[PDB]
Design a binder for this molecule. Structure first.
Ligand SMILES: CC(=O)N[C@@H]1[C@@H](O[C@@H]2O[C@@H](C)[C@@H](O)[C@@H](O)[C@@H]2O)[C@H](O[C@@H]2O[C@H](CO)[C@H](O)[C@H](O)[C@H]2O[C@@H]2O[C@@H](C)[C@@H](O)[C@@H](O)[C@@H]2O)[C@@H](CO)O[C@H]1O
Ligand code: CA
Ligand code: NI
Length: 142
């Protein structure tokens, strides 16, 4: 995959915002996973919490990398979730499910050359906030 993180600085949004956890903190170019360092997002405790970045145009995506929150012993809030790729009309072009990160600070998701404008993370769990230290997105090679 290419090395340019194309998610950086792009428009981000999420299902709701709590504890000041702006959606843009996931694309601010800082993977620091301590919530107190202000670079981790946070939605409400709600069902099917989601976060999304708009790449701004359609890109051939090969890799999406999630960085989990690392403080407060609440890492397992990022579990039972999908990573979704949508085209410009916001239809799904790819979707992968994950049970867990297994205590890892990060997850690399590889997509098979998918042409997508939006990258979404969706929890499938009830009454759980979504918190991401960073989401990085990389174009397929060549
Ligand atoms: C007091 C205040 O100004 N805000 C509190 C939160 O505390 C702030 O954010 C934390 C991440 C720390 O950086 C802390 O120093 C800072 O004041 C508070 O969060 C909890 O704070 C406690 C006690 O210090 C622990 O750090 C705990 O891990 C924090 O709770 C977690 O993070 C929250 C943001 C939520 O995700 C909670 O569900 C987690 O358990 C919160 C909650 O008590 O209240 C703010 O308004
Ligand atoms: Ca960040
Ligand atoms: Ni600190």
């Amino acid at each position: 995959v290419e090395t340019e993180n194309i998610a950086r600085g792009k428009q981000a949004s999420q299902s709701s915002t709590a504890y000041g956890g702006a959606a843009t903190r996931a694309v601010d170019g800082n993977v620091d996973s301590d919530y107190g360092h202000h670079s981790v997002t946070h939605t409400n405790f709600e069902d099917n919490a989601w976060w999304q970045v708009d790449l701004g145009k359609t890109e051939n995506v090969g890799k999406v990398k999630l960085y989990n929150r690392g403080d407060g012993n609440v890492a397992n809030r990022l579990s039972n979730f999908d990573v979704v790729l949508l085209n410009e009309a916001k239809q799904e072009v790819a979707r992968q499910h994950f049970d867990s990160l297994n205590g890892k600070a990060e997850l690399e998701v590889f997509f098979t050359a998918k042409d997508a404008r939006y990258v979404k993370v969706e929890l499938k769990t009830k009454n759980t906030p979504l918190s991401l230290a960073e989401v990085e997105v990389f174009r397929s090679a060549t």
